Amino acid sequence: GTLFEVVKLGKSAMQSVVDDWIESYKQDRDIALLDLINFFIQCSGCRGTVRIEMFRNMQNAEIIRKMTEEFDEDSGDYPLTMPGPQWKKFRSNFCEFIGVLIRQCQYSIIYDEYMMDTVISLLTGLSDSQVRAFRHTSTLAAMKLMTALVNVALNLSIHQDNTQRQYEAERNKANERLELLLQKRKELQENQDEIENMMNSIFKGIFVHRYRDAIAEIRAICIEEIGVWMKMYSDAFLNDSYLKYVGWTLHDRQGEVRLKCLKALQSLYTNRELFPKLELFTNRFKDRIVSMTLDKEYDVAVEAIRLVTLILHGS
Ligand SMILES: O=S1(=O)CCN(Cc2ccco2)CC1
């Protein structure tokens, strides 16, 4: 509305486009998911357009194969790898968009059994594309999606704590206000459970394949982001099964990737509370970690020395 109401509210570029999308979704889901699908397709640098009757008749496999056919056979150069000056902040807007979208959907739409299954399906299928641009765009998106879901789970944890307190204050006094709180307690656990299944799909469907991708930037993206999930939500993500992937990737040929493992590991070891869950990992990868303090790459070696310094200050 008025200059004042707009300024007072102060909506980001990405929040404005998300809120319009969400309203579009509420009028027609199919058209809105179609526009979201064509978003991931166009962000990959694909010239093609998924039509609504393709959306309603075809599987992802065929949609993707059909959209695969509409690339520039000549150029392998796409928005996540174009230098600029436009494409400067595209990558930043592309990442913020995903976060905002899920943040804004996180109380209803996210749970409607259609929006997230449509997205994770497409992103999973694009992530197995032979086309470098599809793998890279989808995989980045999927990683950022995962992070956004982990925040959904963190907010749910605060709401569970609030409701637990409210139930206990009301118990210590069985009217309508109790069973409602017992019912909100149950609904929030069910919400956590559904978020977990989406996280499991993205992890089993995309992360565990892309982390060892041929492209070094894809490897980097996975490793950086699993670092984030482990710091943010240790109970679910910081375990020997997942640390294995951070461990195995210390040996990466490319400096950028190794750098990312080390920074991933710094953010865990820095945390006095997480150290007991790192003991076995330190033992299995001590040699490889410690080797990297004189890594041929100067910027890696620096980060390994910081790591080892953190590891030491722990015990
Ligand atoms: O894993 S933690 O270190 C950080 C998160 N908290 C609560 C939480 C957030 C999401 C689900 O549960 C548990 C301890």
PDB file of all heavy atoms in Angstrom, residues 102 270 302:
ATOM      1  N   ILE A 102      10.776 -21.593   1.672  1.00  0.00           N
ATOM      2  CA  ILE A 102      10.444 -22.652   2.656  1.00  0.00           C
ATOM      3  C   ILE A 102      10.079 -21.953   3.960  1.00  0.00           C
ATOM      4  O   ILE A 102       9.094 -22.373   4.592  1.00  0.00           O
ATOM      5  CB  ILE A 102      11.541 -23.720   2.811  1.00  0.00           C
ATOM      6  CG1 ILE A 102      11.351 -24.869   1.817  1.00  0.00           C
ATOM      7  CG2 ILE A 102      11.575 -24.277   4.230  1.00  0.00           C
ATOM      8  CD1 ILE A 102      11.930 -24.601   0.463  1.00  0.00           C
ATOM      9  N   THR A 270      35.110 -26.392  17.308  1.00  0.00           N
ATOM     10  CA  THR A 270      35.075 -25.078  18.016  1.00  0.00           C
ATOM     11  C   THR A 270      34.081 -25.131  19.178  1.00  0.00           C
ATOM     12  O   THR A 270      34.171 -24.273  20.087  1.00  0.00           O
ATOM     13  CB  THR A 270      34.721 -23.923  17.071  1.00  0.00           C
ATOM     14  OG1 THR A 270      35.042 -22.727  17.770  1.00  0.00           O
ATOM     15  CG2 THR A 270      33.269 -23.873  16.660  1.00  0.00           C
ATOM     16  N   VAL A 302      46.818 -23.417   5.936  1.00  0.00           N
ATOM     17  CA  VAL A 302      46.381 -22.448   6.981  1.00  0.00           C
ATOM     18  C   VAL A 302      45.182 -23.046   7.721  1.00  0.00           C
ATOM     19  O   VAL A 302      45.227 -23.099   8.965  1.00  0.00           O
ATOM     20  CB  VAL A 302      46.033 -21.064   6.404  1.00  0.00           C
ATOM     21  CG1 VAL A 302      45.377 -20.198   7.466  1.00  0.00           C
ATOM     22  CG2 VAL A 302      47.258 -20.357   5.838  1.00  0.00           C
TER      23      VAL A 302
END
